[PDB]
């Protein structure tokens, strides 16, 4: 028993984090087979970031003036590319601890694990969710970038995202492995409007079957609703719209607590119009939506 | 800018990570140097846990009959002993991937993360307080015994828990790696009373601090008071009293944000008596405890 914000072991992605210089820049680099993979604005200066040419910029740069180290050994560097927002470093060694791994573009509401690094060195790691909004609520600070989000199935890293950049409302921006951003973001120095934010409604009722699970009853109600009635509720307080998608989702959930979706819908309703009352959930004083139905199950099961 | 509950990169400890089964019991192993750790309880069968004597049944077990296996590959056992709670099982072959280490036994109020197992397989990563009443709040399933609480220091993995048991009340008890229990606690499957908790002010204090270096400063207040004065309102709610020990600690954070950590006491009294109005700091609704100043500093100066 017991309920966390639980991030996915770090160790596959720690052995593919590198450090890459170009001028007076450093960030992280993202190591796999003979690849390198780094935010392109690497190659901005202080005035460059305002408004950079990034073609005009690469254009400047030699496979020579990109320096990558793993730990202390230094990669030579043998091509270099630009895909989108990051940049493609062919190195002439394969990275031995590359693990078996895929390039995912996540959905919104979905969650993944960020190994937060610093000159390519990882200082720790914590689960996030991609907001509907296309931002994620990370940890990140100067020298972040670079640093990556993932999952992992079995023995399969599946990365979705590349951390780029902190909007000046303190929320995080960045790319998919082929570098094409989350959301409508571009990577200049200009202020950036995120969207409205929404609450991911399958999640926080995922979350709800994992305080159920976990002995955390209280809230539970002798109402019902229906997908149309609870969603009018949804739309007054900023949560997604639940779908039959998302029920369907929830299906195992509700097969392991004998709790129909349409009942879970009703207690949420009712905590969203009523508040918490001072009570906590799964030690939350607020209603969690980083949790997918995938996670709670997972957590709940002791996937490995 | 951001807070999470960050824990550490969890690679090392996942490479020392092994399977330990006796007769019909499977739980987790620490394999370090040539020597494998696990709760002794590993022995038992389901008449036994009631209330074993493990010396007793320790005598019936040969090295043979200890079966730990690391990913794959077979270890063979060639010794075997009892210290406190924890087996420990020499093995001909020294892990190879055992980095730097150090077995401490940590005090109650600090942090560490700990990297939850099933049949010697990690399954995820999350950061925990070793509470006052030292339980901790995990999330642990049956099997994930053996898991291990560790801190990283530069490239030396301290570990200081090892997971034993849950009790009815749905939190964790466990022992230091010399299989010492934290707490009254003992390996026996009978009701335990764990301790009154309270909250770890220092704790609170620190993520003030964390809030106000991250633009939250709604709390921060025109108001002062003496450590006395604090002191009668954090026993009123439960909470630790602040000593000037902890004062010293929280130093740093108050030089960084130049505010006197007897102000920050005032805003945490106000806070305390009067709630939060339903407003959030750090994105959370209560008071959080589970980081310290140290752990505050490192997040926030990109400790690697
Ligand atoms: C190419 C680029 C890089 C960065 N760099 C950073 O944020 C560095 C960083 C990352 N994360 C946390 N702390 C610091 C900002 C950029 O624009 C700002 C205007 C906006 O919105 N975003 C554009
Ligand atoms: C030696 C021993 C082992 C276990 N095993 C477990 O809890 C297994 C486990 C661990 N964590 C989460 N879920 C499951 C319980 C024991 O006593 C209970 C009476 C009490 O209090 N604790 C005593």
Redesign the interface.
Same mark, same amino acid.
């Given at each position: 028993? /017991? +309920?966390?914000?639980?991030? +996915?072991? @770090?160790?596959?992605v720690?052995?593919c984090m590198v450090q890459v210089t170009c001028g007076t820049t450093t960030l992280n680099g993202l190591w796999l087979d003979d690849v390198v993979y780094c935010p392109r604005h690497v190659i901005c200066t202080s005035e460059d970031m305002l408004n950079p040419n990034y073609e005009d910029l690469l254009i400047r740069k030699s496979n020579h003036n990109f320096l990558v180290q793993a730990g202390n050994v230094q990669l030579r560097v043998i091509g270099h590319s630009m895909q989108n927002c990051v940049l493609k470093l062919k190195v002439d060694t394969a990275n031995p601890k590359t693990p078996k791994y895929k390039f995912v573009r996540i959905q919104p509401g979905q969650t993944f694990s960020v190994?937060?690094?610093?000159?390519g060195?990882?200082?720790?790691?914590?689960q996030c969710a991609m907001r509907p909004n296309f931002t994620i609520? /990370?940890? +990140?600070?100067? /020298? @972040?970038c670079g640093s990556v989000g993932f999952n992992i199935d079995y023995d399969c890293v599946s990365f979705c995202y590349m951390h780029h950049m902190?909007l000046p409302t #303190?929320?995080?921006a960045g790319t998919d492995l082929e570098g094409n951003f989350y959301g409508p973001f571009v990577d200049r120095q200009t202020a950036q409007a995120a969207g409205t934010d929404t609450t991911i409604t399958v999640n926080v009722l995922a979350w709800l079957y994992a305080a159920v699970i976990? #002995?955390d009853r209280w809230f539970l109600n002798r109402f019902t609703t229906t997908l149309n009635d609870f969603n009018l509720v949804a739309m007054k307080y900023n949560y997604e719209p639940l779908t039959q998608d998302h029920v369907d989702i929830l299906g195992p959930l509700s097969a392991q607590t004998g709790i129909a979706v349409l009942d879970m819908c009703a207690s949420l309703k009712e905590l969203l119009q009523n /508040?918490?009352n001072?009570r %906590?959930i799964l #030690? @939350?004083?607020?209603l969690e939506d980083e949790f997918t139905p995938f996670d709670v199950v997972?957590?709940? @099961?002791?996937? %490995?």
């Open positions: 028993s /017991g +309920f966390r914000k639980m991030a +996915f072991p @770090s160790g596959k720690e052995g190994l937060a690094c610093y000159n060195s990882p200082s720790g790691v914590y609520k /990370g940890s +990140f600070l100067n /020298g @972040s902190e #303190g929320v995080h976990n #002995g /508040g918490m001072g %906590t #030690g @939350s004083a607020l997972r957590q709940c @099961s002791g996937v %490995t």
